[PDB]
Structures are given as C-alpha cells and as structure tokens.
Design a binder for this molecule. Structure first.
Ligand SMILES: *[C@@H]1O[C@H](CO)[C@@H](O)[C@H](O)[C@H]1NC(C)=O
Ligand SMILES: *[C@@H]1O[C@H](CO)[C@@H](O)[C@H](O)[C@H]1NC(C)=O
Ligand SMILES: *[C@@H]1O[C@H](CO)[C@@H](O)[C@H](O)[C@H]1NC(C)=O
Ligand SMILES: *[C@@H]1O[C@H](CO)[C@@H](O)[C@H](O)[C@H]1NC(C)=O
Ligand SMILES: *[C@@H]1O[C@H](CO)[C@@H](O)[C@H](O)[C@H]1NC(C)=O
Ligand SMILES: *[C@@H]1O[C@H](CO)[C@@H](O)[C@H](O)[C@H]1NC(C)=O
Ligand SMILES: *[C@H]1O[C@H](CO)[C@@H](O)[C@H](O)[C@H]1NC(C)=O
Ligand SMILES: *[C@H]1O[C@H](CO)[C@@H](O)[C@H](O)[C@H]1NC(C)=O
Ligand SMILES: [F-]
Ligand SMILES: [F-]
Ligand SMILES: [Fe+3]
Ligand SMILES: [Fe+3]
Ligand code: NA
Ligand code: NA
Ligand code: NA
Ligand code: NA
Ligand code: NA
Ligand code: NA
Ligand SMILES: [Zn+2]
Ligand SMILES: [Zn+2]
Lengths: 424, 424
C-alpha cells in the first residue's frame, strides 16, 4: 500500500542543488523563533535562510548548520538546520532557502503571543507513514474546514524501518511528501517506535539516529537535555512532549525533567495543558494492549494532580477517546485496580490512524470497557480547536468521509478554568 | 556517619605513582578472562599488566587502555582497564600493576569451567557506600566461614553524589576502601540510582558518567550494546544484569536484548538463572514502595516463563525475601491484581542493606503482605552458595551478629532440575 517511488508526492524539485524535504517547527519556548530544515542532494550548499515579514519587508539572513549521516550502505544528503529568532507575534513571514544556487520560497505565520484567552487550532496526526491512506489523511488535514495552524505529531513518521536495511531513501521520500504542509506550518515532533531504529544485525545501535538528524526540536528552550522530551508554549497551550522509548524510571533525566516541568506550568498564561507521547496509557485495542502500563504507573498520578486537559498518543492504528478516569489507587494488595471516573483526570485520545503502511487495527478488546468512551477502526486525523480559556472543541475526521465531516466531536471543558463535566 | 577522609581504609598506597583503587571483574562470557582496573594519581603510567599462573610460573603481559574524565571542577587521576584473556580454569593467578614505576602485586582464582554440578559461592552486597556500617558489612563478608568467590553488587556504590558537586574524591576513597576485596575476587557490577549522577545545574548531563569510567563490564560478550545491562556465565550460574534507570520500554535496546538473552539461556549447561537489578519488583517497605512496578509490568512474565531461580535487588536499605509469587494475570478490568503463589516464579530478594551512608529503612507496609516471606531492617550482606544443579543455599548475615551467624537461611531448589515447593 506504500506509494511507489515515482509517485507525484515524492517528486524531486527542479534546479541544481534545489532544496527539498523542507520543514519547520517552533524554535523557542514562546513562539518567536522557528527552526528551518531542508536537504540538498547535489552539494553542501549554504545553510543561510533569507526572511522578512509581509509588512516590515526588511530582508534579513540567518546562518544555520549543515550535517550528514550514514546508516547501512546508505549515505544521506546534506541536512540543514537554521533557527530564525526574535520574530514578531502573529505576523506572516517569507523565507527562502538555497541561496547559493536554486532558491525556493515558502512562508509561515508566527503564532499570537501566549495568553489566557488566545484561540488556536491544532492538528493531530499520528503514525502517518507514506501509503495511499497516508496521502488521503494529510490531504484531509489541509482541506479541513477549520484552518489548522500547527500539527501535533504523536510519533511514527516515515516507516522506513520496515524496508530492507531500513532503506533511508524512504526517509527522503517522506520529507518531500509532507513538505506541502510542514514547510508552511510547524509540526511538533514526538518520537515513536518506528524512529528508534535499533538494528544490531547491521551494526546500527544508536537509537533514533536517522530521525534525530532529520528532525530537530528546541529542547534546550525548556531546559531539557534531550530532544526526545521537551516543552513549548504556543498561543494558549502548554504542550509537553514525552518519549515512550526513553528511560523513565525515577531519577532518570526524562523523569526528573517532567517533574520539574509540571511545576513550572502556569495555567494563568497557558490554560490548556496538553501532553504528547507515542504509546497510549489507555488503550482498549488488542494491538499493543497494555504496552502503556509501565509509563502509566510512573506519570498517571502526576497528570491527575496537575489536571492535564488531554493526552494524545498514537501507536495503535486506530482511534479511541477515553472517559476522564484514573487508576492511581493501587497498592499491590488493596485490590483497587479498576479505572474509576475522575473529573480531575485528562481525557486520553489515541489517533495513530493516519495511515502507516496501509493497515488498520480493528481487533478490539471485548466488550468495550467502561473507561472507553468512543473507539473506531478507521483511518483519519484529529483537530483540537481552542476557543478560549474555557472551551476547546476536539473533532475526529475519517478518510472515508468529506474533509468537513466529523464522525466524532466533543467539547473539552478546561480542567483549571471550567471544572464542568464534559463527558459524552 | 560516613568515614572521615583520614580513615585507615582510605589510606593511599606508598611509592611514586603507586596503583590504587585496584579492582577486577569477569572479562568474558565464560570466565577465561578478567578485567583489571586501577588508578594512578601522580602520572599516566603504563596500562600493562603482568600475570602468571601459580603452577605455570610463566610471566606474560597484557596491554590495556588509559582514560580520564572531569565532572564539575573535579579532574580525575589516570584510569586503567586491561583485559587478561585465554586463562585456564580453576587456577590461581598472580598479577602486577604499575610496572613503569611503583609496582603492586595481587592474585585471583579463575572460576572452574561452566558445568551442571559445579559448586560456587556468590556473595551479595547492595548499596554499600562508605560509612562505618559499610566497613562492618565488608568485614563480615571477608570473615565469612563460607568463603565468597565472587561478589554480585546490586547497585549504589560510593554515594559520592551526596556530596557537594558530587565531590568525585569520594569515588577515589571508595575505590581504595573496597580494594582489599575487589582486587582479589571479581565483583559483578549493577548500576543503581546513585550512579546516575544527572546534575544539569553544573552541566553534567551524561548519565552514569563517573561510574562508567571507573568500572567496566564485558557487555559485548553477551552481544549487549550498553554496559548497563549484560550477561555472564560463571561456574554453574547464568547471570543477567539489568539497568533500572535505562529505557526498558518495548522495542528499546535493553528490552530487545533481554528478550533474546533469555532465549539463549541453557539450563542444561548453567542450571542457576540469576537476575540482578537495582530497584526491587517486590518490596513491602515504605521507602521506594512500588518504584519497581514499571519494570515489573515489562519483565515479570518473562522471569516466570523462563523460570528464573532468583532475582536480587537493592535500593531499599533493608532486607527482604519473598515467596515465589507472580502478579501477571492483570488485564485492567478483570480485577486480577493480587500476587499469587507461583512455583514457576523466582524468589525476590532485597539486599540493599550493606550500609550506604549509615541509614536504615525500618518503616514498612503493615501488616506484612502474604507475598513477603521474611523482612528485617538491619545492615548486612547475603550469600548464595550453589551446591549442585539441584540445590543452592542462601543466607543473610546481619552486622550485629557474629560473622558466621545466619539470621535467615533458605535452601533454593532449582526451578529446572529440582522443582519442589521451597516455601517458608
Ligand atoms: C544496500 O544493499 C542492498 C542489498 O543488500 C542493495 O540493493 C542497495 O542498493 C544497497 N545500498 C546502496 C545504495 O548501496
Ligand atoms: C552553486 O553554489 C555554490 C555555492 O558555493 C557555488 O560554489 C557554485 O558555483 C554554484 N554552482 C553553479 C556554478 O551554478
Ligand atoms: C496525493 O494527494 C494529493 C492531494 O489530494 C494529490 O494531488 C496527489 O495526486 C496524491 N498522490 C497520490 C500518489 O495519490
Ligand atoms: C468560549 O467559547 C465558547 C464558544 O465555543 C462559548 O460558548 C463560551 O461562552 C466561551 N467562554 C468564555 C470564557 O468566554
Ligand atoms: C570545587 O568547587 C567548590 C565550589 O563549588 C570549591 O569549594 C572546591 O574547593 C573546589 N575544588 C576543586 C577541585 O577545585
Ligand atoms: C615512571 O614511569 C613512566 C612510565 O614509563 C616513565 O615515563 C617515567 O620516566 C618513570 N619515572 C620514574 C620516577 O620512575
Ligand atoms: C573497619 O575495617 C576493618 C574491620 O575489621 C578495620 O581493620 C578498620 O580499622 C576499620 N576501619 C574503620 C575506619 O572503621
Ligand atoms: C546434591 O546435594 C543435595 C544435598 O546434599 C542432595 O539432596 C541432592 O540430591 C544432590 N543433587 C545432586 C544432583 O547430586
Ligand atoms: F506502531
Ligand atoms: F538507594
Ligand atoms: Fe505506527
Ligand atoms: Fe542505596
Ligand atoms: Na506491530
Ligand atoms: Na505487536
Ligand atoms: Na508498531
Ligand atoms: Na524517597
Ligand atoms: Na530518599
Ligand atoms: Na535513593
Ligand atoms: Zn508505534
Ligand atoms: Zn538505590
């Protein structure tokens, strides 16, 4: 089901050393920066990025860094990463890449300054891959009636690791394919199990190697010491990104960072507290059932204590929306091991149904558990539309439907500013 | 309670560039190799080690590597690691270090070839530290009527991380302190939370940095890609070392390694399957209560399926021995969350009461849970004395009793060669 190499979506842009696989993401904590990334295949080229606003058309230049890597018998092209800083809020900018030779121009609109009642619409995509279904999902995100301004990617990008020797060529195709979206609006990356790429058989033992080279994140901005876990603030949301396949035992770097980070969250500045992770803590599907238990025992109580609004995960190739529940009262022998309704707990949503390599997870645990509000084995994507400090409307759009149809939609009542029961 | 710097046990060996902090560990998979480690403070010196059999007085030389590191404003002396290989079984060997200038001689006895009924006695020490209690525990072990032939260290070594800026000098003192034992018999290293040393405040973001530089392990011998988890075979035991503070999520390096390692175990060759980890999966004490839950969800079922004989851990500053139980039938809503008797399960023992910095954990969950067979808050060490392929004798010696007293002692009946109920 994977799209052939000659497909139009994997078309290489014309012109000598023409920049390709162009993508961007927030480059600082508050939204005044952006990391611009792209690859050149003919030669190193320049890492300089020329930019300017639509209004204050003063053209400026930012220098970046170039790098390369090798996997098996695969050798990458020239990967460029450049950060544009001190940008003005809510203003459109134009940026050009490939100044040395063939130049290409794109644009993006910085988010508005963070604040209590700042509206913003987040796209939710997980386990995209590069199958025909992946193309449909992405198209639906773009043609969505509601204008998505940033994508929160829950993990599992290209699925190159399914090819022989993980044929990283499939990483480059994925970059050209998603360019039509990521180059114009930021995607906040989460690391999934397909990015680990631990392959001892072929002497490739550095976890997340290809992914980490191709996709950078502003982790130092939140005092994290690893790109696999970090935080950013955008508009009225505080987004926390975690790594399911990194150490999370007590005292470990990720564990320690998260504990301190939850303490720095200010619901007065960013009322919507969102958490991303690849593997779902709540999942009633057969596939990967209970794989989220470990991390759950570790962080669930914290999510409840700090009343996180939502937790988005992927991994399971389907869709699921839980009720607000918790299972934090277990003590080995007290028998309290059943999830109970907890209005202080976040809703857990799994949206790893963007397409992957074309397979869907339909085998579900039966009967549907009480903690599971809604579930369905269809390809699709989601949208978290923040209206204000009290309301956020989440909707799920299926690939079999019209780009404007919402097979499932719910209103989120902020755990901090609107303590009302938003159950369905 | 930590012993003062001028303590006799921290004395520095005389002579220019005299080798100090000498220690050894198995250097291969089966026991025909040994890693010799030591530090020189006055100058780099030579990494060559001269060794010879007590029988075959032929003196040979093994070349090694030297390294150094810095923590904060601390600069280490010169660290040497040299592996002596192709040794003969069950034979006494003499080795000398510091050949360049001041030389020091020591010895060790290679274990006998691996076999079904090969007897061997392993000492168990966890969370030693360097307080006076630490000195007492080490004394008892050296004076044990039953001589220990190899120590299985279950994590938390020097506790230097408790000093300002983790004053790494406390790593050097611990090195001299433990020498009187580790330089003659190998100690099998397990990494605990005090080795993590994650200190972002002073730009020390590399987990296990000091520990990984000072203590090496033959991790590649078992095809592991990290020194924090590995396996070795000694006599009639197959030992698996795990990292409580490394990633263990499905698909991670450690997770994958263990899954395959277990498949390579051969009970027809090494009948005793022993697992070491720092954080206990079963712990009825208040301190660190339920910290091992995450790893348990991940590996408990594997331990039961492969019928591990024993699992040793530390972390809790006390002693505990559990019944053979398993808590692997939980499915979120089926209500099966109570540990039950399971003869396929290993016994879980907490033995992190070697002394640490002089504090003991006496507060425990009341009443004592069914899964807990024996628990007591006293400083001490354990002894796992393997007799045959079918019998092994474990004993716990407290620091307040005579060196040959056994406050707790039980016979272990091999899960593969003598599966009889050994409850207490
Ligand atoms: C890597 O090896 C495969 C076959 O093992 C081969 O088809 C492929 O072309 C090699 N990669 C390159 C581009 O050298
Ligand atoms: C492409 O750009 C590089 C930038 O240094 C330059 O050296 C090279 O001459 C250019 N190629 C041509 C001749 O078009
Ligand atoms: C992918 O979808 C886009 C937009 O709908 C379309 O233009 C393109 O032809 C599709 N490519 C493939 C290979 O289906
Ligand atoms: C937030 O927006 C919703 C519209 O979706 C509206 O009904 C609600 O009254 C607003 N709440 C506040 C705090 O103004
Ligand atoms: C290291 O720095 C500390 C202050 O943080 C100071 O008290 C100590 O004397 C210094 N020691 C060394 C090794 O210079
Ligand atoms: C000490 O040994 C080193 C290592 O070979 C040598 O370079 C140096 O000259 C020696 N000095 C003394 C005091 O023996
Ligand atoms: C502890 O170690 C041995 C115990 O036999 C003894 O020789 C030594 O003096 C003691 N050291 C300290 C400082 O307690
Ligand atoms: C080993 O010794 C124990 C106790 O002496 C005995 O009960 C057991 O049967 C023996 N096992 C073998 C295989 O010799
Ligand atoms: F997946
Ligand atoms: F500890
Ligand atoms: Fe996936
Ligand atoms: Fe300890
Ligand atoms: Na799978
Ligand atoms: Na699977
Ligand atoms: Na998968
Ligand atoms: Na504590
Ligand atoms: Na503590
Ligand atoms: Na501790
Ligand atoms: Zn996944
Ligand atoms: Zn510990």
């Amino acid at each position: 089901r994977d799209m052939p190499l000659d497909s139009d979506v994997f078309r290489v842009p014309p012109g000598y050393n023409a920049p390709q696989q162009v993508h961007i993401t927030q480059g600082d904590l508050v939204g005044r920066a952006m990391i611009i990334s792209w690859v050149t295949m003919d030669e190193p080229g320049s890492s300089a990025v020329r930019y300017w606003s639509e209004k204050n058309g003063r053209k400026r230049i930012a220098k970046g860094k170039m790098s390369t890597y090798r996997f098996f018998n695969y050798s990458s092209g020239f990967i460029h990463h450049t950060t544009i800083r001190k940008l003005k809020y809510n203003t459109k900018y134009y940026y050009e890449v490939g100044l040395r030779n063939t130049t290409r121009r794109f644009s993006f609109i910085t988010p508005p300054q963070t604040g209590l009642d700042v509206p913003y619409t987040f796209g939710l995509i997980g386990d995209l891959g590069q199958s025909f279904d992946s193309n449909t999902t992405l198209s639906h995100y773009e043609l969505s009636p509601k204008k998505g301004q940033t994508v929160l990617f829950v993990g599992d990008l290209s699925y190159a690791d399914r090819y022989p020797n993980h044929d990283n060529v499939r990483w480059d195709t994925w970059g050209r394919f998603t360019e039509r979206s990521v180059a114009y609006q930021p995607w906040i990356w989460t690391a999934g199990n397909h990015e680990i790429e631990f392959a001892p058989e072929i002497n490739e033992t550095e976890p997340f190697k290809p992914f980490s080279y191709r996709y950078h994140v502003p982790y130092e901005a939140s005092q994290s010491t690893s790109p696999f876990w970090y935080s950013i603030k955008r508009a009225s949301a505080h987004i926390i990104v975690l790594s399911s396949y990194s150490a999370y035992g007590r005292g470990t770097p990720q564990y320690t960072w998260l504990k301190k980070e939850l303490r720095k969250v200010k619901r007065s500045e960013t009322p919507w507290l969102i958490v991303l992770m690849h593997s779902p803590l709540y999942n009633s599907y057969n596939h990967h059932f209970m794989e989220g238990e470990a991390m759950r025992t570790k962080f669930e109580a914290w999510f409840v204590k700090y009343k996180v609004d939502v937790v988005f995960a992927g991994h399971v190739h389907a869709y699921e929306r839980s009720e607000r529940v918790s299972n934090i009262a277990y003590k080995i022998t007290n028998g309290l091991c059943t999830p109970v309704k907890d209005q202080s707990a976040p809703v857990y949503i799994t949206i790893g149904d963007a397409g992957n390599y074309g397979v869907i997870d339909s085998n579900m645990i039966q009967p549907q558990p009480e903690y599971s509000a809604f579930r369905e084995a269809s390809f699709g994507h989601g949208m978290f539309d923040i209206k204000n400090r009290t309301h956020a409307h989440f909707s799920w759009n299926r690939n079999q439907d019209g780009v404007a149809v919402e097979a499932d939609s719910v209103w989120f009542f902020n755990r901090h500013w609107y303590p009302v029961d938003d159950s369905t």
